[PDB]
């Protein structure tokens, strides 16, 4: 599928009124094809993990959007590694997304991994085509002390 | 004998919860309750789409009567015996 | 049989809500209730301009009696049977 | 018939409010109530300098009895019939 | 006739307050109450070191009975007649 | 005579506390209560794994009856006499 | 109406004691006429869209005011695009406004578009003739956890 | 009264051990007299107006104090202009004040002008002889959601 | 000329497709006419005066631009008051300007007032239709120590 | 007692292996004695007074600690001057203290001076041998709206 | 055990394809052995002690992690020194840790030392293999005024 | 001269249209008289002393101005104490000044005290009736390396 | 060599007085062995590339150090890709280094790749066992305008 | 000499009007004696080492002063370790100092250790009884490119 992408980018370079055979556009169908395969390669205490860098692709305009994910949770019996929370990020972010589904998908992946007391997921991101989306599940929604402990520590 | 129903802070609008995992499936059938697991919760619950005052009219016909109404958080809980 | 009226935190001053979309239009007519949809709300409601204690004197003459008063949030709710 | 008195969160100390603009001026006279408009409020109110339990002893001698005490916010409200 | 006792949010543990400045010194003597002025407060109060349920067993033997329990803030107040 | 049980804000799910350090060890034995000291607390307590409505069905068979339910904080407290 | 504006700006230049025929005021009735036509050319989770740049015209003194709009909402069934929330801004801002009506109009446009659970609209702006106006509709007004989640994330 | 002030400042310059007839103190009784006459020349949504610059005179030591006023209100039927709130400031600030009365006076002037739901007035200022004084009237005092909405937006 | 402006703004309100007789546009020809008359009412050591607030009118699009002027000079015999440097600002800024002429005009007014050793004028401003213009006259141009002393202290 | 201190500092200079008779340690027993006598020379609205500078002596290691006191109160009948709150600070800080007693002592001095509704005292300080101590008395402890109004305005 | 570590680091230098006998790797088995022995050498008012610097070793990858501990407590009868709270930190941090156990261990050590009303421990740290963990014990968990007083003062 | 000032301030209070016999203006002629007597009570390496707080009186309008002095010097044989440089500040600042003379006077006092290689004095201040004045004497004027070493370290 | 490292880390865990067979230290010899193999896996205009993140291993104490590299160069005939400058970084940083050799090695790799006019390499880094090292080669050393253009743009 | 200090601090506690036998002053002569013994326990590329924390004792008033040392040097043949530059700091700072001698002493210790091309030492510090002292030796004094490379990188 790598030659199938590279033929599709060479037809983009011709359709824009640009010369695909010049100094600077020889490996451009092939450098950009291996770019889009990288950009879609995903297919009792409170533990807040913040500043999680995110780089996803908009599924409407196929142009990236760049942001941060904030995750906090209250475990019951099973805790999760701080490097595994980031690979749950990279699986759902390195896809063709919207920010609204990307927030909800991360919360569901942590919910089913651990069955915790509560999950809070906050994704802020800049769409090049900031917006904050926020799921509050479990006891991050029912308790005011628990939601407000999350929201002060992430900043 | 006891039965705890609850709603949110605007009691004009539902949903009003009516039971837990071991609640009576005949009485939940008369109230018209569905059974869901909301996301992030680790338990099942019954619920109807009605306001709480309609349900308090239904439960009155099955021999219940409100002991005490109270509010905890944004929730408003009725206790029926 | 049950009837839930509510006000805000200063019960000296109104408005006090008196009903929902399916409330009795004869009894709302005696209380003097208007029916509005406030902005941002997705439901209709009845309301009067009186304090709640005046309305509790009115509803007493129509065969009601306060079971339980409770406060949920800034709201104060009366349950009348 | 109904009468709603209220205090703040320390019920050892007053003031306890006793009425609104259309409250009974004979019964407010026996309780010793003054009538003020506090700044920022757009309504009048009656109030005494006593704790609420002293006023509940006074209102008991005039044929009242507490139905329900509840707390809404920092306020604690008694309903007397 | 009325008597308002209160505790904090964990009612397993005390102290539970039992009276104000003009409370009955015989009945406070039976409950074992000390009288202090906590710092920042401009009033005196009675208090015991017991949980509230022990005091509710004591006050039952002196002809009282709980009308209404309610919670205001972190405080939980019992009204006894 | 008095007995104060409590749960958190979702009363569909437990645990519900049932007693303090000096509670009746026969009645705690019938309810199935364990006794723990949670960390940071300086007191012992009894607790069961059930919802509160199951415990209210149990305590009804031992000659209790709910006086008043109220909510203080995120906690919901039942008083049984 | 473009010659009707340009004749009205040439009468402004004469009334100010200024010479409308000099080096620097030849296209001034016509550059400013196409400026005022640009400046009035408008006639389960939480999604906060912040830093929305606004440039409106005061309807009292006909002098601009410059600010930011903060919008958050709780959807029920229908969500709205993050580029469509900004065009709802530009329709009501590129008019002759007051800030108080401009806040209320944005909240009503989102309320009727989606029928959400709640709407929060916050407009801060500097009037050259800062002031914060704020509508809280739905469950942003009744819930303290929901209003306070909005107000921490927008800053 | 302008010669009566200027004779009183010339007696100040003599009492300090200073020479009132030198290079630099000729117009000083008259420049300072017109300074003290300038410095005392004052005798459904939430609308927060912040950063209101204030320059008042201390009535104890007759030395200025410099600060900011934060005003927010919830209207009922009548709203007030954003330039009229600032002239209510300048009438009560350009006097001989204390900060504690200056806070309370601004809240009363807005209360009687509009009869709103609530008034919040916050004056921070540096006394050269910061201190924050704060009146919360109406439903800014009874509601916790309304006081906390005011206090997050002013900062 | 105040009725001559107000008739010219009433013809603007009609040409934009707007109703000049409604709630909110009754005093608008007269409030805006007295706005444009205010906005054009101007017709051995180093002393740097910075943060001088400026509010001028663009002469191309008749829309304001907002900025700061930084002035420093080396006197020879005659120094100038720190309140007189600001009125030299307000005379040339409260006109129909460009930023490039407004920089050069301020430097010439200080040059002829004092005949100093050198003059440095730096105007940064945001055009609503930042840009830094900078005149360096005298020994602010010939000396590298003198230009660099100016440019570090103004920031 | 000034010669009694100066003889005690001259025995310190000898005990450290240092030469008390050299260039730089001649007035050192007497300059430091008058330093330790200076360092121990102390023996309806909300009014928050913040940024109160504090310089106290640790009573354990006799080495200073440096901090800020934040005081707010709700008066009943009697208010207190903003220069008198600072002298209550300097009386209790210019002693041999701990931060924990220094917080509690300031709150008691204001409580007995005025009998107010509530007192809030917050001392942050750096111990050279930050830590925040905080007394909340009166209605700053019982009310959540009143404690949170204090804690947002002090920052 | 110091020669037993130094022989284990010399086998690391050989296994990486590196020359252990060169200019720069002669004392490297012995400088790093005394590094790992230093890095594991640990085996009525509110008093918040913040900015407590922490340097612990990850027990998974044996690579450090660097952070800050925030401790606050409400005493009953017994208070604890501000230098003893930091040695409780250094005993549990200078070990092979996880951040989640390091938070819980500090709270238990203060709980058993004093038996206070409540304990709040917040550890933020950067793992080189930020994350916030937070224990709230006692009346920092049951009271909303007490948890929120802690969380505003630590920032 | 203290009764001579207090009679001159009582004539100020009468001339402003204010009642000198009321609640709040009884000690005002005497509190302000002891304020103006305090405000005028002044009558081989590089050592930069910065952040020197200054509070002087304008001699034109008798209203304070508030600023900072930056002093650096290159000694030859005699150095000066860091507490004596600040008393040279307080002698010349606590007078009736202009900023331009206050800069030049501080440089001359240090020049005659030490005879150093060079003196650099920079006073920035806000006039309530910022401006930077700067004397560069000695080898701070002739050397570009020496002036630029001063100007980077003071910021 | 991966079992040879993992046996060397299991002897470290035993020598520290720690139990290598417990909950939390089972994969620790093998997780840390694959960590040290990752951490040592490296064996006419001005183009400044800044903020280049660096993570190297100290060769003295075998503990990381974390920093930033700033590279600028003046090409002659051959320019270099902005992703190739970063892989020159990662080859020399992911080794056992000192900061002083790591600076000099990056400058030599760019010098031999391009033969440019000048090379400037600046590495700031924090050693956990900031320090700035800086090579200036070519015409970044001989020209003062060229070195100072580099040093202002990197910040 | 530790009992000789502790007897000298017990005579300080008596001379201040303080009771040396109370709750809180029992170990105070002995805790402070071991404090003063800790506080005086010291008796081709550019390598800039900045942010070196310093804690010295003033020799005039025996009260600490707290600051930072910035050291840069150009080696000839011999370089110096980055942990040895900090122990040269701690030897000369943990004494009874002045800042002016402490700057000059650090430069001489590095000069004799290495004989480099140039030495630059900059000490900024706050005296509790900021000031910047700066020695520039070697080719940091003669070259303008070399002094200015030092002074931009340290900030
Ligand atoms: C019921 C409650 O939400 C839950 O048990 C807990 N909440 C919290 C917790 N820990 C912290 N830090 N914060 C909480 O809100 N541990 C337990
Ligand atoms: C009833 C409640 O206001 C509403 O259902 C929800 N609130 C919230 C929500 N999600 C977030 N993040 N915050 C809320 O306050 N989802 C649902
Ligand atoms: C009762 C309540 O305080 C009042 O009706 C309102 N409050 C608010 C409001 N709008 C905002 N933004 N915030 C409030 O707190 N509108 C109405
Ligand atoms: C010749 C020289 O430019 C001129 O004489 C002066 N320059 C300066 C000065 N003062 C300062 N601060 N800076 C200068 O550059 N005084 C005199
Ligand atoms: C009861 C209440 O705490 C007290 O009366 C008041 N509180 C407040 C007040 N003023 C302000 N700003 N904030 C308060 O919390 N005035 C009165
Ligand atoms: C019951 C309550 O939590 C406890 O008694 C106290 N809380 C507090 C206190 N002091 C402060 N500052 N804050 C509190 O929350 N002292 C006592
Ligand atoms: C001639 C020269 O200006 C003078 O000798 C010196 N200049 C300097 C100095 N020291 C510093 N830091 N900077 C100088 O510019 N010492 C001596
Ligand atoms: C000789 C000189 O150093 C060299 O030719 C150039 N220098 C520079 C350059 N471009 C920039 N921006 N800066 C220089 O210093 N181009 C060419
Ligand atoms: C002569 C000159 O000062 C000296 O040889 C060097 N200077 C410098 C240098 N390296 C840097 N980065 N900067 C210099 O100024 N290496 C050599
Ligand atoms: Zn897109
Ligand atoms: Zn306007
Ligand atoms: Zn004053
Ligand atoms: Zn323009
Ligand atoms: Zn100490
Ligand atoms: Zn790790
Ligand atoms: Zn002046
Ligand atoms: Zn190292
Ligand atoms: Zn000193």
Numbering used by the authors:
A (entry chain F), G (entry chain G), H (entry chain H), I (entry chain E), J (entry chain I), K (entry chain J), ...: 67 to 109, 127 to 212, 224 to 249
B (entry chain P), C (entry chain Q), D (entry chain R), E (entry chain S), F (entry chain T): 2 to 82
Passage from the reporting paper:
The inhibitory and stimulatory protein complexes were reconstructed applying D5 symmetry, yielding maps with resolution of 2.9 and 3.0 Å, respectively, which allowed building of atomic models. Comparison of the cryo-EM−derived inhibitory and stimulatory GCH1−GFRP complexes reveals a significant increase in the density of the EM map at the core of the GCH1 decamer involving the central five-helix bundle and the 20-stranded β-barrel (region C) as a result of allosteric ligands and GFRP binding. Helices approach each other by moving more than 1 Å, and the β-barrel diameter is reduced by 2 Å. In the inhibitory complex, a high degree of flexibility is responsible for the apparent disorder. The loop does not seem to be held in place by any relevant interaction with the surrounding protein structure. Comparison of the inhibitory GCH1−GFRP−BH4 complex with allosterically inhibited GCH1 shows that binding of GFRP does not change the overall conformation of GCH1 significantly.
Guanosine triphosphate (GTP) cyclohydrolase I (GCH1) (EC:3.5.4.16) catalyzes the conversion of GTP to dihydroneopterin triphosphate (H2NTP). This reaction is the first and rate-limiting step involved in the de novo synthesis of tetrahydrobiopterin (BH4). The effects of GFRP on GCH1 occur via formation of heteromeric protein complexes between GCH1 and GFRP, which are dependent on the intracellular concentrations of the effector molecules phenylalanine or BH4. GCH1−GFRP complexes consist of one GCH1 decamer flanked by two pentameric GFRP complexes.
